[PDB]
Design a protein around this ligand. Structure first.
Ligand SMILES: [Co+2]
Ligand SMILES: [Co+2]
Ligand SMILES: [Fe+2]
Ligand SMILES: [Fe+2]
Lengths: 314, 314
């Protein structure tokens, strides 16, 4: 009776268990898939998602939070089927993922109208189902905090204030967008501890990363495996340094893995150089063992993957 | 047989008859409708489109060309439903409607891959049906010819050269985008006579409009009713001037009417202010009568609404 789950009764936050806070069962461009269905294979997508979730569960993952929202091809019914086939705790979200402008629908519509969409998903349910959103996802990237990006951020703040769900962000680690997202959300009255500023693991600039944590928000070291953003070894070094400097209670770790994704960058022939070891279980194979043999106590692991998510959703 | 029609056998261009070259049965943002179905009412959308098309047919319209493509919510099955209900000849298109960047799908994809999508729709069919595209639609607006906009234009050229279908554009009448579209397409080897440069009726700058006509392309005086872009009377004066100057061989006229559109700008409360007399039959009620009492004969009306679309699709 707190965190809504796809295809299940809602759960208390104290019962979330070991959590992967940022993974995607499937990502696609809504307009492309609608216009050219021949490009997609739902059987393969389902197979890939089920296989990955099953392996995560074998490593002890109890809950997966999937920030696929408008602009990334959120499909609650696809998510339902994956849950059915695996028994995973899956937290679905609402929100809008844009880099520049909103869809034309939003021309001459207020921030209130946008927030209403989020509240609908949180209180009523997603895409005509009774599966409810457990959080709001927003984005900004290379283009910075544009007018429309800002509208979406302020709409997310309204939704959090009304429903108490936390906010997960996508940011670009190199241009201050994460710090700006946090600033705007907190100014709108969002509790800093209800914000996860995403993709900060894409940089080794620990001074910037600590600024965000210092202002009270979780920091997303959340793209493990995506070497094109930052290699695994450098991520590991950065994660280890943050832990040693006392930032464990702010750290969240994940892969941002896409069991299937439709962008051209994700073509199989680019995998070897861009993301050779990227999968939903890389941290069990590399990161966690690495931390443990570099003096990191098990209590820190519990904090990052259990306590922090519990707090985020409380 | 030459021009494919939705839900009908293809027709020869000589049988196209009185044509509205740019009208929309329904426009929506794909991602918004997919994520928040509660905002839409397909019954109402269907009724609106059927009612408008029936009135157009009563006034002698034989064929409607509907350039709703990716980015505007093309839905071939909705189009089929309207054809069945009305008996209209409906030409559907392929293409991409963007102002700034392509959907993320297109990250690291070639211009050829884009063209392949268009060729698929033209040669195989649209959205898994046997209804084929009869033209390619591209756009550019206030942001100008961005890198991604330019890719789409060049993709349209490949599609035209390969399949001979014509190209219809959306442009901004005030920033030279129409002229640039024409230049890029012709430089790629597209026959200027297979291009309609759209939304030129949004300006009363006849020197600009004539520049495009002189270069061999049709000029889209195609937003009659949309006063916020240019009021009916000034459009009429511009149209009449171009006709008196001898340009009826390049003129195409339409409303760009949307029987339903989901953008906030089109909320009913704004209609009286922005587009009070906008509908799919305005040119029958105002424009054509206006031209006639200004000495324009039935032959010129025939050239614009029958002969020009015939040539365009030949
Ligand atoms: Co992201
Ligand atoms: Co247009
Ligand atoms: Fe993500
Ligand atoms: Fe249009």
């Amino acid at each position: 009776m707190r965190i809504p789950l796809v295809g299940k009764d809602s759960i208390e936050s104290k019962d979330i268990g070991f959590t992967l806070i940022h993974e995607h069962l499937r990502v696609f461009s809504e307009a492309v898939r609608q216009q050219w269905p021949h490009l997609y294979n739902e059987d393969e997508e389902f197979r890939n998602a089920v296989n990955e979730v099953k392996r995560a569960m074998q490593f002890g993952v109890k809950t997966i939070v999937d920030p696929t929202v408008m602009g990334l091809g959120r499909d609650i019914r696809f998510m339902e089927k994956v849950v059915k086939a695996t028994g995973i705790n899956l937290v679905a979200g609402t929100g809008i993922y844009i880099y520049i402008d909103l869809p034309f629908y939003f021309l001459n519509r207020s921030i209130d109208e946008i927030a209403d969409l989020f509240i609908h998903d949180i209180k009523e349910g997603i895409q005509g189902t009774l599966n409810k959103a457990g959080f709001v996802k927003i984005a900004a990237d290379e283009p910075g905090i544009t007018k429309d990006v800002e509208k979406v951020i302020r709409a997310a703040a309204i939704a959090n204030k009304e429903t108490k769900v936390p906010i997960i962000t996508h940011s670009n680690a190199h241009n201050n967008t994460g710090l700006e997202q946090q600033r705007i959300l907190t100014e709108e009255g969002v509790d800093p501890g209800k914000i996860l500023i995403g993709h900060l693991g894409d940089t080794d600039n620990i001074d910037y990363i600590k600024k965000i944590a210092d202002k009270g928000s979780f920091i997303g070291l959340d793209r493990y495996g995506l070497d094109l953003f930052l290699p695994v070894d450098k991520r590991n070094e950065t994660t280890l340094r943050l832990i040693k400097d006392g930032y464990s209670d702010k750290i969240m770790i994940s892969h941002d893995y896409c069991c299937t994704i439709d962008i051209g960058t994700a073509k199989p022939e680019y995998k070897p150089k861009l993301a050779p070891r990227w999968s939903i279980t890389l941290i069990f194979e590399d990161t966690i063992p690495f931390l443990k043999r570099n003096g990191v106590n098990e209590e820190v692991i519990a904090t990052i993957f259990k306590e922090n998510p519990k707090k985020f959703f409380s």
